[PDB]
Write a protein that binds this ligand. Structure first.
Ligand SMILES: CN(c1nccc(-c2cnc3ccccn23)n1)C1CCCCC1
Length: 346
């Protein structure tokens, strides 16, 4: 008569509540494996993520605690909803894993990118991406690490964001994606709201070109790709770089920089229609404003939402929603356990 049960999913063991049946591994990230499942109580499918020993290290603990907290207080339509949280362990001493049960989407953005999208769907997706980033910002949150994988969508094309970004040693087997990070992040410069716009621009560009814009083994290569395409940033920008960094970027082989109609030609945009020819120019325009190295010259979230390519989905009921301690600390794996544990069970 145990409230839980166990099943082997892939390699790890998922121990979940009885209400959740027929588990199917729908994915795997860095902080856990995610299975889809049916919730006999709510009569619907859901996604369950297992946080195995989230307190094993500050990187994982900080991430877990933070996500657990913000996912319970924040409430938006474009930010994955938290249905239920639980732990098969009965006490703080036995405590080991944390199961996050959420609503089940249909696919990853990485999958959507691998396909041609009409201006209607491409713009609607970008609108939701910005609609949410809008809320996250109003909630005092600035992602700074948005990427295709952390964004999920349904078939009806509705879009939702999974995590809340950063706030860092990781002795693990798998890498981290840096392709969609902003220059101020790649070079460390201090950021602001529009630091996420850079990520959105990296995605929109990939939704079109169908290939990762600025790929790279290290930030060395990544920054190279940034200039090889956009060109070397104006001298007004370099005087904001750390003297040690400035000395590195300035003394780097220059570039004139390709124009946008070059980077994103019409071959990538479906402009067989008089209506498509227009939207294609508009899309190419929002891109030329989002993919701007200089933060001071980059388009804000609010402007990108007033852009003719996006505004065609506006609605004061969606974007305009009411926003809600200081979870940016430093403890030990035994404290983090206590913190996370008590957070799990209110
Ligand atoms: C870390 N993973 C993850 N974490 C939290 C939630 C979800 C999630 C929620 N609904 C769906 C539907 C399909 C695939 C994944 N999901 N996935 C990965 C993210 C990148 C794509 C594969 C799973």
């Amino acid at each position: 008569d145990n409230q839980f049960y166990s099943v082997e999913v892939g390699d790890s063991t998922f121990t979940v509540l009885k209400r959740y049946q027929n588990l199917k591994p729908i994915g795997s990230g860095a902080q856990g494996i995610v299975c889809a499942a049916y919730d006999a109580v709510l009569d619907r499918n859901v996604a369950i993520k297992k946080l195995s020993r989230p307190f094993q290290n500050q990187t994982h603990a900080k991430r877990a605690y933070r996500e657990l907290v913000l996912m319970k207080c924040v409430n938006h339509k474009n930010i994955i909803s938290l249905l239920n949280v639980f732990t098969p362990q009965k006490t703080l001493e036995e405590f080991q894993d944390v199961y996050l049960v959420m609503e089940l989407m249909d696919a990853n953005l990485c999958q959507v990118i691998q396909m041609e999208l009409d201006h209607e769907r491409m713009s609607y997706l970008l609108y939701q991406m910005l609609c949410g980033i809008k809320h996250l910002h109003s909630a005092g949150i600035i992602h700074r690490d948005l990427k295709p994988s952390n964004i999920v969508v349904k078939s009806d094309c509705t879009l939702k964001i999974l995590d809340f970004g950063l706030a860092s040693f990781m002795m693990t087997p798998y890498v981290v994606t840096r392709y969609y990070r902003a220059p101020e992040v790649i070079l460390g410069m201090g950021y602001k709201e529009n630091v996420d716009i850079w990520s959105v621009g990296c995605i929109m560009g990939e939704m079109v070109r169908h290939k990762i814009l600025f790929p790279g083994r290290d930030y060395i290569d990544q920054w190279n790709k940034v200039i090889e395409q956009l060109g070397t940033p104006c001298p007004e920008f370099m005087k904001k770089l750390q003297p040690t960094v400035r000395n590195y970027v300035e003394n780097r082989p220059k570039y004139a920089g390709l124009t946008f109609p070059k980077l994103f030609p019409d071959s990538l945009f479906p402009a067989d229609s008089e209506h498509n020819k227009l939207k294609a120019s508009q899309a190419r325009d929002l891109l030329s404003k989002m993919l701007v190295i200089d933060p001071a010259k980059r388009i804000s979230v609010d402007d990108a939402l007033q852009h003719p390519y996006i505004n065609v989905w506006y609605d004061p009921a969606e974007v305009e929603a009411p926003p809600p301690q200081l979870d940016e600390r430093e403890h030990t794996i035994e404290e983090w356990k206590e913190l996370i544990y008590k957070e799990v069970m209110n």
